[PDB]
Amino acid sequence: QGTVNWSVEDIVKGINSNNLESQLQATQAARKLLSREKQPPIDNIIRAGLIPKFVSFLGKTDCSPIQFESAWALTNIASGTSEQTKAVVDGGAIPAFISLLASPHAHISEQAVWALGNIAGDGSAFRDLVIKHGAIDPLLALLAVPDLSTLACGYLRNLTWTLSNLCRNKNPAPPLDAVEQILPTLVRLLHHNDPEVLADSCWAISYLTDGPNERIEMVVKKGVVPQLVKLLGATELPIVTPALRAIGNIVTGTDEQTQKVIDAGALAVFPSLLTNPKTNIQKEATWTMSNITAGRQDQIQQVVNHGLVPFLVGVLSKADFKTQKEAAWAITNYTSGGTVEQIVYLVHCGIIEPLMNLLSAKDTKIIQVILDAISNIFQAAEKLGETEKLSIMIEECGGLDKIEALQRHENESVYKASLNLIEKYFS
């Protein structure tokens, strides 16, 4: 009640006094204003020019409470818009917070961790700026214990989250040496028993694997794939989501990198993923599948062996359109690099009808994708001399009607392929 609902001008008055305790009192009052969920007066506090004062309070070693209160107040200012975070940075908060990482008071170093997390989370520039100030060493030292379980849950969760922000964002991606420096601790967090630490550890790994093959390799070589695959089967959605994202990122790389995902036993989880109630999970799982069917023939064969083709037929038959679109890609990739037998197996699974039905979609791009898949399947049928057997299949399900109509489509690329099919296999 003492420091509850102060006016900004009273806070300004207490902070401008030459009384450290008065300043502490005013700072707490500011912290409480900024701690409210309904429109905290962040811009009002900034306009009052209180930031430089807060920053100086960070270095008041003899008055830890005011160190804590200002750190908390600055954290919440830094949690706002880019402009508001910039204000905190502009005040010299970065080095001051990094100095607090070594505080003997756990709740104060934690607040510093939290603050740096918000600053780094703004984007690439501030992220790299926090790194240049040398935040990584002191951050990792806080996690350098024989067993993470001895750390307070909240403390560990904050450390993990802040680290994940240091791994986040592109253009540019985090510095290579920074990633290398962080990875070993990150891998360790990836094995912790706490659901929130696991979720944010997966997000970190997902950020790191979201780039060129070299970035993917840095992570893969650390041997995290088996663990990712395991977390991929976790019950918690917040864990599955980032885990799937990471696996999805990894299979966009080389065939060898993709193979590690397969060897880890990832495909066995996909019967669930491809039928998951959360559409975002279905979409990303199908997307992941499309990048696997874009692999080698022995990898396509692994997809067949795990009985995932029927699941692709299902998603193609019924699913959120965005998911169905990833399924169309999955089939086209499959038919592009697959053997004749593998492609034939596709048809026997019933891929044709659900494929034809999606030719009624208004998305020009999916029509192009489907038409290419058809071409590929006919080419496989040509080597068997059974193109006609396919023509009847497509005709009986009302596919020919749609291909014919696609000749009067408005898009150049579409009708070209349409008539090519029409006059080559249907005349």
């Binding site: 954290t75 949690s79 939290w114 990122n249």
Partner: peptide, 14 residues
């Protein structure tokens, strides 16, 4: 074929 590729801030409340 080829392969196709694809909260940051937290306020501390009571």
């Amino acid at each position: 074929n080829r392969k196709r590729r694809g909260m940051p801030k937290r306020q501390r409340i009571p």
